[PDB]
Each structure stands twice: as structure tokens, then as C-alpha cells.
Subunit: 220 residues, 2 copies
């Protein structure tokens, strides 16, 4: 049984990933801010029993890694998926975004994901996979983020920070993935099944990849 850690698993694609990994036979550790308040996560917990361990945790809390670690004990993480993401201000307007909103956006979407992944990295299996939920809107070459520029810039910043982390290693000890889930309203189930296949395709490769739910590369 692989150990899979999904950070941000109460709903949407995060929950879908927990479900999809469970269906492959993994032991899943599913972190959410309010796990008890997610009927989706509760339903998965009931069905999988002990194979789905819900964990209360918040990416933005500085003790998050410590709490996850204490919970995991000596168990190694085969697949670490950080499914951080907020939209930022609904108007996506550079003229109006304030300091508090800027901090929240870039901490949640870019900085805290790296802080957490780095802090847990000593537990990640060699030849495993660390993946971050990114977006097509992160791509500079595609340049598709005009209607949500702040969101897209936060995901470009995430991609940048992951590339910077890669640059700290002589050779990668695990793969580093930046994931585009597709434009899910495309079901969560199809997206998650695809993303699981993309993640598993990178296991043992120790490569940096920016890929979508079909395992197709996106340009930077």
C-alpha cells in the first residue's frame, strides 16, 4: 500500500484525488481545514474506513508540517499532493487588491505550499512524487489568464518556486509535478483519474513536469 498525502481534500479535485487514490489501493491521508464539516470526506471515510485518514490542518499554519509528521509517525510518503488554491479577490483587479489580500493570495498559492512540501520532504520516498496543483493560467507561453490575472500570477509564482526548489538538488530525489486539472465543473472523477495516472507516470523518473490531467505537457 502506497502512502498518499493530499493537502486540501475536503471538496472538489482534492476530494476526487483522495477517492481515486483509494480506488487504486492506497492508504490516503487527507488534510482539510474543517474535515468534520465536509460531507464528501465523511462519506469517503465511512466507505474506506481506516484507509482514509482525515487530518485537521491548515497550510497557512506554521505547525502544519509538524502536525502532519506527528500523525504519520515513521511512515514515508510515496505521493505528496499539495492542493492549495484560492482564487484571490473576486474582481481580479490590480487597482484594488490590498496588502492583506496580496499576502493571503501569494502565501496560500505559492509560498506556503513550498514551505510545507520542503518541511515534509525528508519523509518522501526516494523515487516518489511531490505534486502541486497549479493551472493552465500559470503558463507564460499560453498567456490565457487575462480574465483572472491575479490567480494566474499566483500560480506562475508557485511554478517559479517549484523550479527554484528543483535547482537546490544535484539530481532530483523524487519527481516534482505542477498539475493542471482541466476546467473541472469535465467531472471531478475524470480529472482525478487522469491526474492519478499522470502522477504515477512520474514515479521513478525523478523529473520536473508541468502536465495536465491527460499527462500532456504545458509550456512554461
Amino acid at each position: 500500500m502506497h502512502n498518499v498525502l493530499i493537502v486540501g481534500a475536503s471538496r472538489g479535485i482534492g476530494l476526487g484525488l483522495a477517492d481515486a487514490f483509494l480506488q487504486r489501493g492506497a492508504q490516503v491521508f487527507a488534510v482539510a481545514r474543517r474535515p468534520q464539516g465536509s460531507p464528501g470526506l465523511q462519506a469517503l471515510a465511512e466507505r474506506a474506513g481506516e484507509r482514509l485518514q482525515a487530518v485537521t490542518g491548515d497550510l497557512n499554519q506554521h505547525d502544519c508540517a509538524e502536525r502532519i509528521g506527528e500523525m504519520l509517525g515513521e511512515r514515508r510518503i510515496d505521493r505528496l499532493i499539495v492542493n492549495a488554491g484560492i482564487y484571490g479577490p473576486q474582481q481580479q483587479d490590480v487597482a484594488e487588491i490590498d496588502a492583506e489580500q496580496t499576502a493571503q493570495l501569494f502565501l496560500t498559492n505559492a509560498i506556503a505550499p513550498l514551505r510545507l512540501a520542503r518541511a515534509l520532504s525528508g519523509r518522501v520516498s526516494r523515487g516518489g512524487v511531490v505534486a502541486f496543483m497549479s493551472s493552465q493560467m500559470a503558463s507564460l507561453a499560453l498567456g490565457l489568464s487575462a480574465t483572472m490575472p491575479l490567480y494566474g500570477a499566483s500560480k506562475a509564482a508557485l511554478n517559479s518556486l517549484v523550479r527554484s526548489w528543483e535547482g537546490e538538488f544535484e539530481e532530483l530525489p523524487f519527481s516534482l509535478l505542477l498539475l493542471h486539472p482541466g476546467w473541472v465543473r469535465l467531472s471531478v472523477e475524470e480529472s482525478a483519474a487522469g491526474l492519478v495516472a499522470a502522477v504515477e507516470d512520474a514515479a521513478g523518473v525523478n523529473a520536473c513536469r508541468f502536465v495536465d490531467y491527460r499527462n500532456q505537457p504545458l509550456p512554461w
Copy 2:
């Protein structure tokens, strides 16, 4: 140029370093330069340029982080159009460049100063930019995802990737660009940010950047280029 032409060049962040070098280099080409600085009176470099160029160098008090910056620049310009708009001002972020230690206040400061405020300002002045002009943002090779050189200064690099992203998103609002949009890498330059090991003088960096800016005039394109006018990958 001919036809009694004298380009109006606006440099945001011109008190020292590359920004001052750009003001000097544009003045040497014959431009009317509007040099925006937080404390223009406290810059010996800008005072020296003012003495040499007289009225062809107008110092303007202004701060990229202030929401009235565009208004102050506009009031100063009157009805004049901007032929070249260069946003140079930027910060390094925390000295340690460490994702584990940066706090909320520092994160806001970094991304506002290096990414969001440049777009806020440029957008607010964009109606004044000449058709066939150039709007350029000082970016960095550390912004490039393909080069993956950002490990040296990850936070700074991420803030410039965010800048690049926002400029591309702005481009994507136009059916046809009315001016060029440039992301500039100045090289590693001997300034307070670059340090004593930097291989380029301000003078050579600025001369190169002026040539790259002028090479984009009338093209109405997006480019990510260095001080030699060589393209960088995204």
C-alpha cells in the same frame, strides 16, 4: 529625429542604479525625460543630470506603492503623451530569500512592489502612451521558468515571474496591442542590489536597454529580452 520630434520618456524609479543610468542614457539620445523618484531632492545623481540637461530632465516626486502616483505623473505631464514608459523601481525582498521565514507583511510588500503596482501604474497611464510606443517593465532572468536560475533568489524570482504573468495577462486583454510590452533583463549590474561582483556597469546595461527599448518601438509586440536585446525564454 526629424519633424521636430522629441520623445517623452518616463522612468519610474530613477534616483540611483539602473534607473538613473536609463535617465542619463535617454537624455544622451535627445529625449525629454520625466524621472520619477521617491525623494528626487535627495539624489545627487538626479541633481547632476538636472544641472547638465536643465529642463529636458524633469524630476517628479512619486512612489510606485502610492495609489496617487499615476495622478501625480499625469498632473506633471499635462497633455503630453508618453512615448516610452519604463517601470524600473523594485525591491529584492527578504535578504535570506527563504520561503520558510517570509511573513505576511513581507509577502505583500514583495508582490505589490514587484508585480502588482507596476501593472496598476502602467494601466492607469496607458491612455497617455503614444500609439506605437513602448511600455517596459524591469524584470529579471530569475523570472524565467525555462532557465530555472531562480534558486539563487527564489522569492525575488517568483515576484518577477508574477510580474511577467501579469504583463502577459494584460496583453491578452487587447485584440491588437497599441504599444509594445517589454519585460527587460538588465544583466547583473553593479548597483546596491547587484553588488561588487556584478559584471556590468550601469552605463553599459542602460545603453543596451535603451537600444532594446528603441528596437521595439512601432512593432507593438510582447518581448522578454536582455540588455543585448537577446530574447529570454519564459
